[PDB]
Design a protein around this ligand. Structure first.
Ligand code: MG
Ligand code: MG
Ligand code: MG
Ligand code: MG
Ligand code: MG
Ligand code: MG
Ligand code: MG
Ligand code: MG
Ligand code: MG
Ligand code: MG
Ligand code: MG
Ligand code: MG
Ligand code: MG
Ligand code: MG
Ligand code: MG
Ligand code: MG
Ligand code: MG
Ligand code: MG
Ligand code: MG
Ligand code: MG
Ligand code: MG
Ligand code: MG
Ligand code: MG
Lengths: 229, 64, 105, 143
RNA sequence: GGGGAAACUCACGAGCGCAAGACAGAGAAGGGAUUGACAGAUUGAGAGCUCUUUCUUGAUUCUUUGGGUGGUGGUGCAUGGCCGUUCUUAGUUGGUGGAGUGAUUUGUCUGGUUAAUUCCGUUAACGAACGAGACCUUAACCUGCUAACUAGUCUGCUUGUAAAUAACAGGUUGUACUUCUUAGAGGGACUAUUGUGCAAUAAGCCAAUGGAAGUUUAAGGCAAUAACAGGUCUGUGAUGCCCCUAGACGUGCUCGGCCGCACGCGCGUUACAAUGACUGGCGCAAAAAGUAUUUCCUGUCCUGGGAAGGUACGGGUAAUCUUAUUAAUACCAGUCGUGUUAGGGAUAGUUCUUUGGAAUUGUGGAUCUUGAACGAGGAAUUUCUAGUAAGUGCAAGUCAUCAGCUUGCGUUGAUUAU
């Protein structure tokens, strides 16, 4: 009988907030390898965090540094050395399909002084390459001068508006520190339609318009006549 | 303001284009066909396509 | 025959996942011989509403965001022994899906 | 096994819900567990008798109709208590009489009023942050 | 500006104390760097805060010279992020081809048609991208499925008033049922059927019928290209630069203030009353909420005139308990009877009660008085076509306590348009 009973409302809201706590915790520290999300299965026995990244290798750490740093770090706020709170790092199969990742890639290139257009091109091409169905990049900021300015780079399709917007679209945005002020970098990868329950590509449900009309196939057969001899 | 999106029209056009023989003068029967015949995500949209596709059927009962 | 009435409670943040557990728990329990199941009962869908003034600084017209979190609670009853349950709970149920159990005779 | 000689009809109007039970007897009229003569708006009481009269003391005299209503407002409930009667008298004749007798009464009521069989579709319409109510809004000084 | 400020918040004002001045260079230090502190004396204050006084304590440090932290402090015209507006209007582009030396154009059009660059169709254009659609949520239909001791109906029993039986309440019970309730699957509208207008064929428009449902069904969510040097650096451990730095714009404490009044604006609340007020009677609602022990919702009961108390008996961390009910308008009866009468209730005076260390510059609530303008409002001017306006109460945010605000909910329920 787990300590205190709680309004499935009250306890659920608590659940969500905890998850959003973890998200800030990871993303803020795991700012090296493509961080993505967290499948958290909580049991009154074991809290299981599963970090999804483009570069899982980075999460585990060196000797096992980060892996322990994070697992321990959690133990510091909601500890339970009983291996209860155990972390796992998942591999993000198609790198170029994760926007959260690409932004970091872009965040890296920009701090290494790679010009803007040249920059974005590489990420966008690389994204479409990985199977994107449409990609866009936004970079608001003091683009090489006084006033602010907003740069836009777009390729292929894109779902601007609709409910399907959030379904076929991935969007992550980061702040890039400069001795200038700040750079805003938004990435909108538009995932491909995936009808295979046996695949981790993006979407699963078709686009609401996207209406195909399978043409009739071909047929042949036999007959069972009543012979005439 | 009952007008048809281009997509709605294209569908009805191409459906009729491929299955004319099979298509009936009854919406319900046709709607069933249209659904068994292709990928119409929205159940509602399916009808629109059939409701209109059925319309064309009666305009071909004319020829032009 | 040591029969124990088991209460399966399932509460979840989204319907997609909670309906799979429910659908399959019964699918699986009906198929066992030492089993008696009370149909999967759906409690009333509780909705937590949070209305928020959009913009951070209070300028521009009135813009309000109506945010919702739906919580579906499903309840299933079982006629079994203690091993029978742990036999049917052997699924592969999604995350954030709480499952509570009550055993009586 | 069991099987009472009963009919279960319902009426509704903007939340008003009318549980109407019809069994054969001597003409009883129960509404939430009392005689029609005691509804709140002594006025609308007539509305409920409209079906009764529209058909004839005949059908009412042979049966015992008990209704329970816990709708929303005084007026609305009455509309449901009304709608249940009408639906029930017809519903009775369906399974317990000639399907033809049902048609007679249905058109009979339909002809006089639809609010006895049809359902008053409309409900309430939700407000909007655009103003003080469902479609009104904060003043707007222009000049 | 979630802006409902008693403190706090808080930035503002008066006064007072803490350093959480790290990290480095140099000087200092166990023969002491430095904290603490009775007691009087000072304070607003048992602040060693300060002075007189002398004993503890252990290098956590002092000292300068640099140099940080932190800052609701400054620049939204240095900026991210976010949001408002143009506008939810219906627009916006680019490839190839056509025209121009060129900015540019055609494509996105003459005419119809549509809420719509929505279609018909035209056609030096052809193919395409984002937007409206499509979509998503909620509402309206399903006597047919799926089920139900945290819904309810029925069936056999039995109980109370009654003469019984009827009638009406109550208790049960059944692997009984689903109409009511719940919610999950799936139905269902698409503009369908019929005739005029259109008519070139058309897209479509109209009217009638059937329909739970025909204004794209209703209400919303989402919201294109540009841009407004719109707004926020006082929401942000998002930041550039510039400011402050220990008698600091850091942080804390005590007490004030943001509600100060000759007035000028802008949302609103109540009303001028007999289509009413007051006394009494009357089982009609919806949606929300709710705890770690007593700390949250609070039912039963006891005490007070009353607000409110008590802890007597209790359920609930919830379709199980506050509740299937505790709304108010409405309806029946009675009093008043046009009388700024009290309709109206501002202002004010003792008393009582709750929140809070504290309410005095009235927190809120109860009692008895006091009883103002107001007699339907000039020039102007705002929303608003259906369960919509209006009226009427109920919730939820804020919240210890405070709504006249906000975000929702239901009841009563229409004039005029189309
Ligand atoms: Mg900007
Ligand atoms: Mg103010
Ligand atoms: Mg202060
Ligand atoms: Mg700083
Ligand atoms: Mg700051
Ligand atoms: Mg060209
Ligand atoms: Mg040329
Ligand atoms: Mg074109
Ligand atoms: Mg033009
Ligand atoms: Mg042009
Ligand atoms: Mg034109
Ligand atoms: Mg709409
Ligand atoms: Mg916009
Ligand atoms: Mg800001
Ligand atoms: Mg100071
Ligand atoms: Mg009490
Ligand atoms: Mg309550
Ligand atoms: Mg009087
Ligand atoms: Mg006083
Ligand atoms: Mg007062
Ligand atoms: Mg009101
Ligand atoms: Mg409260
Ligand atoms: Mg309140």
């Amino acid at each position: 009988k787990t300590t205190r009973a709680i309004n499935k409302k009250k306890k659920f809201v608590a659940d969500g907030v905890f998850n959003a706590e973890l998200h800030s915790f990871f993303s803020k520290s795991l700012q090296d390898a493509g961080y993505a999300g967290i499948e958290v299965r909580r049991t009154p026995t074991k809290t299981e965090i599963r970090i999804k990244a483009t570069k899982p290798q980075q999460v585990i750490g060196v000797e096992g540094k980060k892996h322990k740093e994070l697992t321990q770090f959690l133990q510091k706020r909601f500890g339970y050395s009983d291996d209860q709170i155990q972390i796992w790092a998942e591999p993000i199969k198609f790198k170029g399909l994760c926007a959260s990742a690409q932004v970091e890639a872009m965040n890296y290139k920009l701090l290494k002084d790679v010009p803007v257009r040249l920059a974005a091109n590489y990420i966008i091409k690389s994204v479409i390459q990985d199977g994107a169905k449409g990609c866009e990049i936004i970079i608001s900021g003091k683009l090489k001068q006084q006033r602010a300015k907003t740069m836009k780079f777009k390729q292929g399709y894109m779902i601007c508006t609709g409910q399907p917007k959030n379904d076929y679209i991935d969007v992550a945005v980061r702040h890039v520190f400069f001795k200038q002020g700040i750079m805003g970098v938004k990435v909108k990868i538009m995932l491909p339609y995936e009808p295979n329950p046996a695949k981790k590509f993006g979407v699963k449900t078709p686009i609401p318009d996207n209406v195909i009309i399978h043409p009739p196939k071909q047929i042949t057969d036999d007959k069972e006549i009543r012979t005439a001899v | 303001g009952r007008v048809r999106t281009k997509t709605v029209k294209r569908a009805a056009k191409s459906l009729i284009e491929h299955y004319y023989s099979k298509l009936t003068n009854d919406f319900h029967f046709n709607k069933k066909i249209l659904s068994e015949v292709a990928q119409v995500p929205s159940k509602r949209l399916r009808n629109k396509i059939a409701g209109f596709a059925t319309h064309l059927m009666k305009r071909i009962q004319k020829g032009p | 025959v040591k029969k124990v009435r088991v209460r399966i409670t399932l509460t979840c943040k989204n319907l997609k996942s909670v309906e799979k557990a429910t659908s399959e728990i019964v699918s699986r329990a009906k198929k066992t011989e030492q089993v008696e199941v009370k149909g999967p009962v759906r409690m009333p869908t509780k909705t937590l509403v949070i209305t928020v003034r959009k913009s951070p600084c209070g300028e521009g017209s009135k813009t309000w965001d109506r945010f919702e979190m739906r919580i579906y609670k499903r309840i299933i009853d079982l006629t079994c022994n203690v091993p029978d349950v742990k036999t049917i709970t052997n699924f592969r149920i999604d995350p954030g899906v709480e499952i509570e159990l009550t055993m009586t005779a | 096994q069991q099987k009472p000689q009963l009919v279960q009809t319902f009426g509704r109007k903007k939340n008003a819900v009318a549980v109407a039970s019809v069994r054969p007897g001597k003409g009883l009229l129960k509404v939430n567990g009392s005689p029609i003569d005691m509804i709140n708006p002594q006025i609308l009481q007539a509305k409920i008798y409209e079906p009764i009269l529209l058909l004839g003391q005949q059908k009412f005299a042979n049966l015992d109709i008990r209704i329970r209503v816990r709708g929303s407002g005084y007026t609305s409930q009455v509309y449901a208590i009304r709608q249940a009667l009408s639906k029930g008298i017809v519903a009775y004749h369906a399974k317990y009489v000639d399907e033809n007798s049902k048609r007679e009464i249905k058109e009979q009521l339909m002809q006089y009023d639809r609010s006895l069989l049809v359902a008053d579709p409309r409900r309430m319409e939700p407000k909007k942050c655009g103003g003080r109510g469902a479609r009104s809004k904060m003043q707007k000084a222009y000049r």
